[PDB]
Amino acid sequence: HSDMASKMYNTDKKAFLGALKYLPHAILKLLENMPHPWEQAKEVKVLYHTSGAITFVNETPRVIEPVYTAQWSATWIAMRREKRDRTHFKRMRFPPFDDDEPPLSYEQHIENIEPLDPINLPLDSQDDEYVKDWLYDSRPLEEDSKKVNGTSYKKWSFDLPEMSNLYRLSTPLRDEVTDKNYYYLFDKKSFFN
Amino acid sequence: HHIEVVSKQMDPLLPRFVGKKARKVVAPTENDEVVPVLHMDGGEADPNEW
Amino acid sequence: KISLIQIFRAHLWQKIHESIVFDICQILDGELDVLQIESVTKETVHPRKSYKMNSSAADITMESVHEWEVSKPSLLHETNDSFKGLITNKMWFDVQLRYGDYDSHDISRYVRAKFLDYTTDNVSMYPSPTGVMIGIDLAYNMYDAYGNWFNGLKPLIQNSMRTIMKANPALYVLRERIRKGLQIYQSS
Amino acid sequence: SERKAINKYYPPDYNPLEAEKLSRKMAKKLKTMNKSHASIRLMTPFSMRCLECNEYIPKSRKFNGKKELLKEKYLDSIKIYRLTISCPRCANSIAFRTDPGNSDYVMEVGG
Amino acid sequence: LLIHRKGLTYLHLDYNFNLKPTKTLTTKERKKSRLGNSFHLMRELLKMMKLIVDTHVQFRLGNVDAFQLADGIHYILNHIGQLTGIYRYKYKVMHQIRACKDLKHIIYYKFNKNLGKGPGCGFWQPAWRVWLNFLRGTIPLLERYIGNLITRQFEGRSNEIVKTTTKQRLDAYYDLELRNSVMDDILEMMPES
Amino acid sequence: DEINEPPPNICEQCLGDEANIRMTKIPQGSECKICTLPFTLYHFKTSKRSNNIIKTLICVRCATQRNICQCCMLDSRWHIPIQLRDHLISLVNEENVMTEEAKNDMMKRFLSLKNVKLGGAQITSDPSEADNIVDKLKNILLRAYASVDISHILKKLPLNESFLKNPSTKSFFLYNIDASIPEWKITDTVSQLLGIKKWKDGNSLSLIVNHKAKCGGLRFQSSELGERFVSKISETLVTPKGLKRGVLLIDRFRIFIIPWSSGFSAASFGTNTAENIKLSLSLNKLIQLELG
Amino acid sequence: MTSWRDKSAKVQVKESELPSSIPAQTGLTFNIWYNKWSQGFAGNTRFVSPFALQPQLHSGKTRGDNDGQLFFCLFFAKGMCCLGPKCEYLHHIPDEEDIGKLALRTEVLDCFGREKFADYREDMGGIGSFRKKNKTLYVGGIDGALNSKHLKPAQIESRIRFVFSRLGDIDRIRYVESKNCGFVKFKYQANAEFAKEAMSNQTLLLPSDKEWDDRREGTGLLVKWANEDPDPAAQKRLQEELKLESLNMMVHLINNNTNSA
Amino acid sequence: VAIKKPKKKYGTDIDYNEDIVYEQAPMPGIYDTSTEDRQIKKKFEQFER
RNA sequence: GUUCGCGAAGUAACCCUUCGUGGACAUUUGGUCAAUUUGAAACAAUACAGAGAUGAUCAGCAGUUCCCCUGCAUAAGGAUGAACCGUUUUACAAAGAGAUUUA
Ligand SMILES: O=P(O)(O)O[C@H]1[C@H](OP(=O)(O)O)[C@@H](OP(=O)(O)O)[C@H](OP(=O)(O)O)[C@@H](OP(=O)(O)O)[C@H]1OP(=O)(O)O
C-alpha cells in the first residue's frame, strides 16, 4: 500500500480514510507501550486491519509497582552518574529527520543491526543478588510460576529479601516520610477547606 | 422458496450505509379523496369601513 | 515577518554568504606566499547550505606545500597559541551566518558551540580536521572566529574581518534595507 | 490555507538563483506579460454623460476599469495616465487624462 | 488521502507532518483548502507521535546513545509547545504544556543537585503521563470530530440546517415573529376577500 | 417507513431450482438503478457452489410500479421484458400503453414515491385482468438517381454468365437480397447446405452484402468447395435468352447467383450510398427480365 | 471446437509487460484519491491501444470453462489479459451456446458482467442501457484510426468488414462516407458488447501498410452505441421485426395460460 | 447544427424541456375522458407537424 | 496423515517390517469489489463581464429557494455567500345614448 494507483485500491482507500477517527486511539496505545530506558527493544502485540489501514498496539503496559519504582530509581542513579562524568553531552537535533525523506523502512535499515546497550545500573552482586538476574527484563519474572500468577502478569507476590532489595534501590524515588503528622495542615482535607 | 435472510458482517472502517447520501427529494401528494370544506352559508353586509 | 521578507528579499542571505566567502579568497591570495598555499579553493556550495542551521560543510579549503603545524582551537581574539599539537597539510573555512536575538546573541558562544558540534558530528562533512569557523551575526553586525590557526592568519584574519564588515557590498545592502525599514537617517 | 503563511513548500530539487534565469526567459512568451494595460477598480470624479445611449454616470460610481501608462510624460518628467471605463447600458469605453499641472481631469472619446 | 480527495493537491503534507502550500493560491482555493481544527489537531498528534518514534529510530540505527535517547524523549515531552504547535488548534492543551513545564522544574532541581547546568536529564516518566492523560480525553473528542468530517466527505452536509437564534440574529428573528402576529390579527378582523 | 418495509420482489427463475437460499440483507445497500435512491440490497447465490452473485438492482417501489422483479427486471407474470409487455397490450387495447421514465434526477425520485402503477402494471398484477388479455391475444393468432454514371461498375458485375457445374470458381454474385435478410442468415443457409457448420473457425466462406445495392458476393477458400456449392443447389431459373441462374432459398425469399470467376472485393457494389441505390434500381429490371 | 476447444488460452501480455497504472501526465501534480493529474489544463487523453485481439490465436480453454463461468474476460477483448489459462473468465468469441447461457442474465448486464444503466451515457458510450436491447454499434473516429490515410470510401468499409467479422455474427454493416462513420449490427447483443470493448481505441491499418510503425501515434477509433436509424426504409424494418417478435412471444405466452388454465 | 443546452449549474439541475416537470396528474374522474384524450393528442401531434 | 481393529507374507516365536481391508479423527473459503481511454472529482489558465441597499462611499442581520461551499458544529464565515431585481388582463356586473343586424 505504498503506491495506491490501481483501481483495486479503491476500496482500501476508503478503509484508510474511515480509519482516521480511530487514529487517536492508535497513538495512545503506541505511546503507552513505549520502551523504558532499560530496554533495547520491545515486542508488542498488535491488531491490524487486513488492508493495512490502521495498526493498534493490542497490549496494556502493566508493571509491578515496587519493581517499576526500583527500575526508574536505578536509571535515576545511572543518569546522575552519567551527567557527572561526561565531558560533553550532545543533545540530539529535533526533528531527527528532514521532512523530505520518507520514514525509512524497518527491515532494510533497522532490523539487521545489533541494537545498543540500554541504561542499566551495574547492580553490585553482593548487595543486589536477589534482583540482579531479573530487574531489567521486559516483563520481570513473567514466567516464574511462584512470583507471579503467569504470563497474564497479574497479582505478584514476593519474599522478604527481594522486597527489601527493591526497597533499597528505590531510595532516590521513595516517599522518605513515615509519620502522618508531617501532613498536618497539608493534606487534601485542609486543601479543600 | 424458503429463503433465509442474514446480515453481512460490515467492515468497521468502510462507511456503513454505502447508498446513504445527503440528497434532497421533493415528494408527491397522494390525493385520492377530496376533503369537503364544510363552512356554513353566508351577516354578510358590509360598508366601506374596512 | 513582512519586514524581514522585505529586508532579506531577492535571496540576500545567500548573496551575503557568497560575498564573505569570495572576500576571504581575495585576501588569501593577497598574502599567499607567507602562508605557503599551493591553491585556495572555494568549493561548490549547495544553495540551501547558507541558510541550513542544522549542519554545514567547508567553504574555502587551503592546500599547503609544507605541512602546517596548527594550534589548539581557540577564539579569534585569543592571546597565545601552542602550535605543537597537530601537524596537518589542509585547512578549511566555514562562514556561518546567524540572526541574533536579545537572549542568544553572543557570537563568541555560538561559534564555539557550532564548531565543537559540527566537527564531532558524522553527517557534517569536512575535508580535513583542523579548520576554523567564522560566524557573523547579521542582526548585531558582530563577527567571531573559532578554530585552530597554524601561523600568521590570526593577525591576518582579524585585520581582514575589520575590513570585510565595513566594506562588504552585500552587507551594505543588508544595512541599507534595515535603515529603509527603520526610516532612520544620520544627521551631521 | 492561511492569510499569513511562513513557509511555502518548494520542490526538493530547487534553488532560487537558477530559477531567476529560467523564470525570466518564460517571462517573454506569456500572453499576460505582453499585454500590460492595468486593470483597476475606480470611481469617476466628474459626473458623466454617455454619448451613445445618453446615460448619466451619477456623481462618482464604481467601475472596474483599465489604466494605461500613456506614452506622454507631463513636463520633463511627471507620469500621466489614461483610464478607460465601460458604460452600464451600452458597450462603450470612455477615456480619461490626468493633468498634473491642472489638478482636475480632462476627458476624451465617448463621454 | 483526505487532502487529495478534497482536490487540494496544491497542499503538500510533509513527512514531518507540516502542511504547506505548493504555490500562491487563488481565493477560491484558499476558501476551499481551509482545513478545520480536527484535521490540524489530528495532524499535530501525528507530528508529536512521529517525533517520539524517530528518536528510537535514531537510537536503534546507532546514531544515539541510550542516555541521549532518554534525554531526547524528555526534551520532546517538555517542549511540545515549541516543537509541534498543537496549542493553536486546541488551546486547552495549555494545561498539559504548563504541567510538563512545572514537572520539569521539580525533576531538574532534584536531578541537578550537585551537578552543573547541562542537558542530560532523562527522567521522562512524569511528563509521559501528562500526555497519555491528554490522549485519554481527546479520543472521544476527535472520534466525534473526524467522524463528522469523514461522513461529510462520503455523504455531503445535510440540507436541513436549521439555524438557532443567537445574539447575532435576535433582532432579525424578533421582527419575523412580530410581523406574523400583526398579519394574523388583522387577517382575522377582515370580513372577506 | 424505515422500520416497515415490503419483502423483495424476485423472480422464481432468478432464485432457480434449489429449495433453501441463503440471502444477505444490507439495509442501505446500493442506490436504485431507476430512481437513484437507496434501498435494502438483497443478494444471494443460486447454489452454494455457484460463482455468480445475483444482486437486487432496483428498489421495491420501482419494482412494484413496473411489476417486475428486482434482479432481472422482467415482468413477474409472463416473464417478458417491459418493452415487449407494453407492446403486446398495445395490440389488445389498440392504444399505446407505455411506462415513461424521467431523465432528470429530481423527477426520477419524484416518479418513484407515487403509488401508481406504470404502463402494463395495471394489467399485470391483476390475474383476472391479465388472463382475459391472453385470450384476446389468441384471437389475434386466428388472424396469424437517374443522373449517376453507373456504367463503370456493371462491367465488373457478371450479369451475363451462367450457373453451370463446369466453371470452377471461388466467388459468386448474390443479387435480389432484400433490405431484410441479415448477413448471418445467408452464411447459415449456405453452411447448412454444405454441412461445413461452425464455418467461422476455419474461415471456409467469406460473405459481403451491401443491403443498399440489394446485392452481394460470397467468396470460398478451397475451390473444390465451389463444386459442392453448385451441386447442392437443385432449383435454377433459366432466363428466356438462356443463362441459367441458381437460387439460394432463404425462407420466402429468392437470391440469384452467378460464378464471378474472380474476387469481387468490397466496393464492387458501390463506393457511395447514393451510388449504390441506383445499382439496386439497375438490377430490379434484370430480375423482372430474368423472371418475366 | 477445432479453433477454440482444442487448445488452451494463451497469455496475451506478460504481467511485467502490462501498462503502468498511472495515466500519461496531463497535469502538474498526480492526485492519489482520483488517480488522475490535477493542476495545469487537461490536454487530450485518448490514445491508441497498444494491444489487440487476434481471435483465432488467443482463444482457448480457460479456468472459467471448467467452472461454468458465464462471463467473458474484459481484457481478453482488449488483448490485455495477463492471466491466460489461469483466468476466471472466458476467452472466446460468443457463440449461440454461450449466449443461451446468458439468456436470463443479459437483460440487466452485459457479456462482461458489468451492470447496465437506466439511460445511455450522453455521448452514447460506455456499457449500455437495459431499456433498449441495442445491437448496433457506431464505429466513429475513423480518421485518427487510419492515421489520416485517404484510402477511399469503400476501402475503409472493407477494413470494418474484415475486423468485425471475426468478432461474431453480423446482421449488417453500413458505411457512410459523408459522415465518415460506420454502423455495424450484430446478430446478438452479446457480440455487440464484446466487439465494442474489443475495437475501442484500436486502429484499422493492417501491416500491409507503410504506417504500421506509427500505429501508436494516432488517436484511435471510437466504437459507441448507435442511435435509431432515421430512414423509413429501416423504420419499417424495425416494426416488422417487432411484429415477428410479438407473434413469437404470444405463441409462447398462450402456452403459459394453457398450462395455467 | 443543434442548439446547445444550458450547462448544469449544480448536480440535480432540471431540464424542464426534457420531461413533465412534477407531473401532478388530475384526480381520476368518473365522466370518462377517453375520446377527449385522443382528440388532443391528434391535435397536439398536428400542431407539432 | 494419525489412531483403533481384522487378515496375509517375511523376520520372528505373538514382538518388528511390508500391503490388503473395516472404523474413528478433519468437512464447503471469497466477491455489493476484474488491471489505463467509454459511466463520470475539481482547480488553475485565456478571454470577456465587474462588485447590496444610494447621489457617492461603507457595517451588517435575516428571510424564500427542487443552489450549496468551508467548518466538528445547532457557533461562525462564504460579496449582507449566491439566486431575488423580471414578467404582468376574466369569480366581473348594473344603469344610461348614436350606427348594424334580424326577421
Ligand atoms: O535560563 P533559566 O531561566 O535559568 O532556565 C534554564 C532553562 O529552563 P527554564 O527557563 O524553564 O528554567 C533551560 O531550558 P529552556 O527553558 O531553555 O527550555 C534549562 O535547560 P534544559 O531545558 O536543557 O534542561 C536550564 O536548566 P539546566 O541548565 O539544568 O539544563 C534552566 O536553568 P536552571 O537549571 O538554572 O533552572
Ligand SMILES: [Mg+2]
Ligand atoms: Mg452569513
Ligand SMILES: [Mg+2]
Ligand atoms: Mg444571505
Ligand SMILES: [Zn+2]
Ligand atoms: Zn452608454
Ligand SMILES: [Zn+2]
Ligand atoms: Zn427505485
Ligand SMILES: [Zn+2]
Ligand atoms: Zn427476475
Ligand SMILES: [Zn+2]
Ligand atoms: Zn482473462
